[PDB]
Design an enzyme around this catalytic site. Structure first.
Site, short mmCIF file in Angstrom:
data_model
loop_
_atom_site.label_atom_id
_atom_site.label_comp_id
_atom_site.label_asym_id
_atom_site.label_seq_id
_atom_site.Cartn_x
_atom_site.Cartn_y
_atom_site.Cartn_z
N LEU B 43 59.80 42.99 3.72
CA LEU B 43 59.83 41.58 4.42
C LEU B 43 59.14 40.36 4.05
O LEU B 43 59.18 39.58 4.08
CB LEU B 43 59.46 41.92 5.94
CG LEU B 43 60.06 43.13 6.82
CD1 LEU B 43 59.63 43.29 8.28
CD2 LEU B 43 61.40 42.65 6.53
N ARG B 45 55.17 39.72 1.19
CA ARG B 45 53.93 40.05 0.59
C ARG B 45 52.98 38.77 0.10
O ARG B 45 53.74 37.49 -0.17
CB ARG B 45 54.27 41.02 -0.54
CG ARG B 45 54.75 40.24 -1.70
CD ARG B 45 55.25 41.32 -2.93
NE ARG B 45 53.88 41.93 -3.30
CZ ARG B 45 53.65 42.74 -4.42
NH1 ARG B 45 54.79 43.30 -4.82
NH2 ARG B 45 52.47 42.88 -4.81
N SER B 49 47.92 41.51 1.32
CA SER B 49 48.75 42.51 1.60
C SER B 49 50.26 42.71 1.30
O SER B 49 50.72 41.71 1.06
CB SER B 49 48.34 43.06 3.11
OG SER B 49 48.92 41.99 3.99
N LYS B 66 52.45 47.02 7.17
CA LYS B 66 51.54 46.24 6.56
C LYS B 66 50.42 47.05 5.74
O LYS B 66 49.66 47.50 6.28
CB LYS B 66 50.83 45.27 7.57
CG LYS B 66 49.79 44.12 6.79
CD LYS B 66 49.39 43.22 7.89
CE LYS B 66 48.61 42.29 7.24
NZ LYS B 66 47.97 41.05 7.96
N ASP B 154 44.52 30.67 11.58
CA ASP B 154 45.44 30.88 10.84
C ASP B 154 46.72 30.56 11.61
O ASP B 154 47.82 31.33 11.47
CB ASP B 154 45.66 32.31 10.12
CG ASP B 154 46.50 32.15 8.86
OD1 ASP B 154 46.42 31.15 8.27
OD2 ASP B 154 46.81 33.15 8.36
N1 LIG Z 1 56.97 42.63 13.96
C1 LIG Z 1 57.55 42.01 12.85
N2 LIG Z 1 59.01 42.01 12.82
C2 LIG Z 1 59.74 41.47 11.83
N3 LIG Z 1 58.88 40.84 10.74
C3 LIG Z 1 57.64 41.02 10.87
C4 LIG Z 1 56.85 41.70 11.92
N4 LIG Z 1 55.55 41.43 11.58
C5 LIG Z 1 55.30 41.15 10.35
N5 LIG Z 1 56.61 40.95 9.77
C6 LIG Z 1 56.59 40.35 8.62
O1 LIG Z 1 55.30 39.91 7.96
C7 LIG Z 1 55.44 38.87 7.23
C8 LIG Z 1 54.15 38.27 7.35
O2 LIG Z 1 53.14 39.20 6.54
P1 LIG Z 1 51.68 38.85 6.85
O3 LIG Z 1 51.40 37.44 7.55
O4 LIG Z 1 50.96 39.94 7.63
O5 LIG Z 1 51.09 38.91 5.49
P2 LIG Z 1 49.53 38.17 5.03
O6 LIG Z 1 48.74 37.92 6.15
O7 LIG Z 1 48.87 39.37 4.30
C9 LIG Z 1 49.82 36.92 3.79
P3 LIG Z 1 49.02 35.25 4.17
O8 LIG Z 1 47.70 35.87 4.91
O9 LIG Z 1 48.98 34.37 3.19
O10 LIG Z 1 49.85 34.65 5.22
C10 LIG Z 1 56.29 38.01 7.64
O11 LIG Z 1 57.41 37.24 6.65
C11 LIG Z 1 57.51 38.81 8.57
O12 LIG Z 1 58.57 38.93 8.08
MG LIG Z 2 50.76 35.25 7.12
MG LIG Z 3 47.25 36.63 6.74
#
Ligand SMILES: Nc1ncnc2c1ncn2[C@@H]1O[C@H](COP(=O)(O)OP(=O)(O)CP(=O)(O)O)[C@@H](O)[C@H]1O
Ligand SMILES: [Mg+2]
Ligand SMILES: [Mg+2]
Ligand SMILES: Nc1ncnc2c1ncn2[C@@H]1O[C@H](COP(=O)(O)OP(=O)(O)CP(=O)(O)O)[C@@H](O)[C@H]1O
Ligand SMILES: [Mg+2]
Ligand SMILES: [Mg+2]
Ligand SMILES: [Zn+2]
Ligand SMILES: [Zn+2]
EC number: 2.7.11.1
Lengths: 201, 330, 201, 332
Positions: B43, B45, B49, B66, B154
């Site tokens: 989905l 990265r 993570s 995640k 955030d």
């Molecule tokens: N419950 C859910 N249903 C569908 N997709 C989900 C979801 N929960 C998370 N996602 C996916 O999670 C992705 C975002 O991931 P996440 O924000 O946790 O990464 P991250 O926090 O490590 C990177 P950053 O901190 O730079 O934003 C979204 O693009 C979404 O597609």
């Molecule tokens: Mg994010």
């Molecule tokens: Mg994040």
């Protein structure tokens, strides 16, 4: 130095086994090959350790159309020979030595393979290797065996070997490869989605 | 030095609660069986993570995994405690289980799956009432975490999941989230650049819940004016300039002199002088149907230099912009 | 001549890709490796094109425990690096060239493979090869790669590669090997009987 | 003066009146069926002329025996395939189901009905007196049919008769050496197993008939009731006749030669010597005693004769005291 021992001793011919004396001397096992290989008696007498054309200009010229036509004959004879109980016993002995190689698959655990042709028709496919554990055919490791016709081994040689010797059939692999990404398994749906994405170019 | 600042609402929540709440470092993890999950589709990265779509083979339901990389042994403890403290909350993402790779010890979080009609092709399809609705949903969530003494730090469209099919909204990504202690200073290298509050751009370590309210304002502006992002900067310097060209340079220096903020010399050299522009300036023939006098007034109270003078989450909910929304809960 | 370009240019190291400049310079991506590789800074500064210990330069008690300990570090770094979007793109480019080899299986039709480790733990297994068409692991053809730790590539590299690039997933084989003896197929009962006969010794 | 002509007593003129689309197998054509309906399972046996496999017809899920004929002779293949069809449906005759071939190598393969043969290697030592009388009557029931059809078997041996003791089933197989009988016409003497070769084959007498099989049947009977397999254990085609001469005597041997003026090979009379005709009661001991009867010896004595013309026919053999308990047990 004979012809048969010389040919099978050559590099790239480690798969071949030396055909017995009386098997070629017995004309019962050579029928149907007259109009199948060019220069039959030339191909026959040469591998049978006989004198060449005694008076016809002995000068070989380009015997590549004769000597490598004698290789064609012995190759086809070898195909009929390794189906016989004597021939199988010789191949089975080479099988114990591992003259043919070991299975490339990791979870076959270096299972020794048998030579096999995809087609019984010359000049259609090269010699392959059959693993009795995974029961699939592979391309030979070295480039040596990449220039040997598969028709010289046949399509049913490894099959008929375990017909007469079922005790040599290896136990099917106890383990298999399991995809692990970050400690997680991979659901089969993943591969289905990737195929659909692949069909979009 | 700088002048101290404390939160107006939910000021003393962590300073009375049991220490087994705001202290995430002494927390322990309930590691469940990992073999119950199989990856299906990536989905997304990022830096911290990797995120996968997976199928829990025990109940045959869709679960989002995640995978947290060994970043910081306290950062992992932070997000995992907050997710549990806010677990079950309004529009808060649900932490189902916390598994880990027994070989590499790299932990992985699993969440409920929300069939997100991606906002890349959604924010250009939303109507006036839709924007008012989902914005009220975020406030419904922001008011909870703030009441629990937890800043999000955030708030961005990429971190709010929306399933328009069932009018579902969920707030995710709680890695940068942190408990609020009054007086204590925090780090200013948080949140997205386009959503960074003025306090983060002038190095003011003593912010509170009001930081998310600024990020919410940037979201509202980007939606009702059809400009994503609204404050399009290139660094942490040009960003404030982008803001200063809209909110004016007049109220900026007033914000600095109020708290005696040691402003970086590079700013006043490039800040120049910009007058405060009206919110009615960013309205054209496209975004006209999204803009209302109540919308501009709500946004005007959202985007402020002084964090202390910004609308709270509950105060924001008590606004004419959300009149058609609340009355439709009969 | 740098260290990274030299090492990856060596014989038997055709699988390796050259790690970018800032990925090692970024200390955020190297954590947890201090008490995992002996002589950390020695292993780090050597591959980072830095000066030696400044003084006792002559190989500090046979630098085979230092230089080949620097190989250990870069190998583990390579594992973390090829999971990143940049690292994958580099391997995917080598994949297009076929630096890793082609599938031994005949009915995969020389499908180019990807490197893979059976275990993420060093000194437990050597590097293997993953065919995306047959989805199984194989032992490398040449003997060169038979002395390279699989932990330097990971267990989920090829898996995560098609996660971000599903368009590269090959169509499953259109053909398969079918046993033919004298033109006849072989009933699956045949293999079952041979296994029972094999379990009699 | 050459050898004296010999004609069959029974079924003498059968092929000399029948349509030519019967005894002429060379002008016969093959009904090649779909080969893909067969999959090999287990090797039952193989020899000089062909390989034999146990297979499963995947269309009806039944067990089928596949005999793979190698390109030996383009007329020998036509011979066995015509005889199998002409005798098809006969009593105790093996059933030719289909005739497939490899489309690549053109190597034909015969498929037959499957008979769960309790192998005679461990069966002939378990049979009782009535059992021997029973199955022997079954072979005669088949031999009289092919002889009536003008077809010699010329390969009657225990290795070519299938027995399913479970259902008391007997089938006669291996019809490769089988040949149509033309009166007066000469044949080849390099046929049948050595231990079952008739005296006419050992003295090079090319003009034999159906009676050849009757000698081979005698050798089977003797090997079963005396518990000696094989009964006439020779080492070549010379020592074989000597083995027979030591039992049937050298007295009746030369009478057989002088009757037909057979040009005997010089090496024989040099090593034949003089042997008196031994009694059949000589080969009886405490083991085979329960299998030997006065009717059995009398039947065997009329089976094993030098003069093929003086040997029992298949129908004549069935009308013998040895098969009295058998025929009377068909009253159902
Ligand atoms: N419950 C859910 N249903 C569908 N997709 C989900 C979801 N929960 C998370 N996602 C996916 O999670 C992705 C975002 O991931 P996440 O924000 O946790 O990464 P991250 O926090 O490590 C990177 P950053 O901190 O730079 O934003 C979204 O693009 C979404 O597609
Ligand atoms: Mg994010
Ligand atoms: Mg994040
Ligand atoms: N109907 C059947 N049921 C079970 N087995 C059968 C069978 N028909 C034939 N067989 C197998 O056939 C084998 C004999 O094969 P066949 O006699 O046809 O070979 P052949 O004639 O080419 C060699 P030779 O002429 O020297 O006897 C026997 O061992 C038997 O197991
Ligand atoms: Mg036979
Ligand atoms: Mg036969
Ligand atoms: Zn294998
Ligand atoms: Zn493959």
């Amino acid at each position: 130095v004979s012809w048969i021992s010389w040919f099978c001793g050559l590099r790239g011919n480690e798969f071949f086994c030396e055909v017995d004396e009386d098997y070629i001397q017995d004309k019962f096992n050579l029928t149907g090959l007259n109009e199948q290989v060019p220069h039959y008696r030339q191909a026959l007498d040469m591998i049978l350790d006989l004198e060449p054309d005694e008076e016809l200009e002995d000068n070989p010229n380009q015997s590549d159309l004769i000597e490598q036509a004698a290789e064609m004959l012995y190759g086809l004879i070898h195909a009929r020979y390794i189906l016989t109980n004597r021939g199988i016993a010789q191949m089975l002995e080479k099988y114990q030595q591992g003259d043919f190689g070991y299975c490339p698959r990791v979870y076959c655990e270096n299972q020794p393979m048998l030579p096999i042709g995809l087609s019984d028709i010359p000049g259609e496919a090269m010699v392959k290797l059959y693993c009795p554990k995974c029961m699939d055919v592979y391309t030979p490791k070295s480039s040596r065996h990449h220039h040997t016709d598969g028709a010289y081994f046949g399509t049913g040689f490894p099959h008929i070997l375990f017909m007469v010797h079922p005790e040599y059939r290896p136990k099917r692999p106890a383990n298999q490869f399991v995809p692990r990404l970050y400690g997680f398994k991979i659901h089969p749906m993943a591969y289905q989605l990737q195929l659909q994405a692949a069909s979009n170019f | 030095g700088p002048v101290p600042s404390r939160a107006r609402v939910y000021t003393d929540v962590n300073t009375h609660r049991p220490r087994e709440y705001w202290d995430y470092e002494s927390h322990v993890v309930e590691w469940g069986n990992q073999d119950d999950y199989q990856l299906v589709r990536k989905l997304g990265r990022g830096k911290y993570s990797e995120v996968f779509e997976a199928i829990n083979i025990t109940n045959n339901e869709k679960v989002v995994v995640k995978i947290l990389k060994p970043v910081k042994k306290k950062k992992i403890k932070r997000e995992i405690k907050i997710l549990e403290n806010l677990r079950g909350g309004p529009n808060i993402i649900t932490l189902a289980d916390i598994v880990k790779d027994p070989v590499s010890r790299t932990p992985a979080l699993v969440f409920e799956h929300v069939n997100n009609t991606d906002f890349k092709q959604l924010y250009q399809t939303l109507t006036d009432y839709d924007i008012r609705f989902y914005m009220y949903e975020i406030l419904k969530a922001l008011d909870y975490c703030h009441s629990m003494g937890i800043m999000h730090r955030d708030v961005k469209p990429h971190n709010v999941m929306i399933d328009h099919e069932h009018r579902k909204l969920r707030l995710i990504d709680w890695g940068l989230a942190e408990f609020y202690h009054p007086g204590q200073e925090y780090n200013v290298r948080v949140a997205s650049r386009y959503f960074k509050g003025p306090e983060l751009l002038v190095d003011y370590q003593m912010y509170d819940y009001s930081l998310d309210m600024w990020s919410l304002g940037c979201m509202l502006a980007s939606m009702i004016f059809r400009k994503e992002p609204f404050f399009h900067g290139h660094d942490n310097y040009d960003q404030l300039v982008r803001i200063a060209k809209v909110l004016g340079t007049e109220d900026l220096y007033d914000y600095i002199d109020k708290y005696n903020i040691e402003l970086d010399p590079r700013f006043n050299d490039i800040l120049g002088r910009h007058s405060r522009k009206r919110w009615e300036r960013f309205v054209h023939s496209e975004n006209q149907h999204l803009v209302s006098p109540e919308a501009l007034d709500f946004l005007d109270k959202l985007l402020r230099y002084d964090h202390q003078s910004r609308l709270t989450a509950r105060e924001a909910m008590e606004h004419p912009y959300f009149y058609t929304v609340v009355k439709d809960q009969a």
